[PDB]
Amino acid sequence: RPTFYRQELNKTIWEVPERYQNLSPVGSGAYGSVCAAFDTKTGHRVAVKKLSRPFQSIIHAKRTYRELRLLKHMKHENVIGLLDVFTPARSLEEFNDVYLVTHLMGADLNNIVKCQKLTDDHVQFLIYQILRGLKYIHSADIIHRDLKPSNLAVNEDCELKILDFGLAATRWYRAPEIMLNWMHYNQTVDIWSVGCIMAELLTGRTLFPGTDHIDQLKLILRLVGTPGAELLKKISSESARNYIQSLAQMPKMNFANVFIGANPLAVDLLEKMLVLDSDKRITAAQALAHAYFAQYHDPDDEPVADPYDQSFESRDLLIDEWKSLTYDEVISFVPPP
């Protein structure tokens, strides 16, 4: 066991290995707090996240386990993965804190609206990297479900990694089919969000700034138009069918209009990402093969993930069971070279 030191940072004790120096708060959430630090082993800067109250409840405990399992699996250039995982606990019985370590990027995509705007080449590069990361995640049968600019960590080289949770509205970037319920959807819900993000990078404006879930649907249909019979027939919920139809009727807009100026290949890709019908939306793999990315696409370097076991998601276990499972995963961690 390495030597650990303690430090108070904004009202909580951080207890970390001496290896991590110059802890500097980046920010917080409901699920945890993150400090930048210097890793003396590598001479690289890292992000250290201290989970907030990991075994407060079965929902905290299961989320803690899910986060550790996910982060241990992700091994891709465009997805945040794990450099280290530690606890000051020397046994199961004293295990109440979990810390996770990743490479520090320095900013997120949303705090790149500082830039004033991006050239088409920069949009191509950033969206290419998101889609490359999503290909990999999606291939493990994982769906992000909350992709937004604050979930995309970007360094000064414009390299990008997908985060599970960022600092800091979800609904602005959420797909219409999961706006009211979770009955009929797939991994392309993340593609919708990528479309929304791409639009905002090209435009400097949030595409669909809805004030609530029904206003959100309203703004969405104003762009893509009210659905025809072929989509309405797949909506189970009489409540959802009625909101969609009760707008009035709206023509699909000309994306060449709303995105004039843009590379028409960008516009064409957007029209394929922002398809209302979940079953017809382009996948991450299909999107990477689009001509918009001809400068970056290489099918030989767009890997898929090893098989990921998410059977635990179906399980209803006791806080102590989630906690033991989490502990095993901490003990079994092997750092990358």
Ligand SMILES: CC(C)n1c(Nc2ccccc2F)nc2cnc(Oc3c(F)cccc3F)nc21
């Ligand atoms: C701040 C937080 C969202 N965060 C995480 N979280 C995290 C997730 C899983 C395991 C360990 C972790 F520390 N890793 C980060 C890497 N890089 C950056 O960069 C920044 C930035 F420095 C300031 C603001 C926005 C960012 F994305 N943020 C990271």
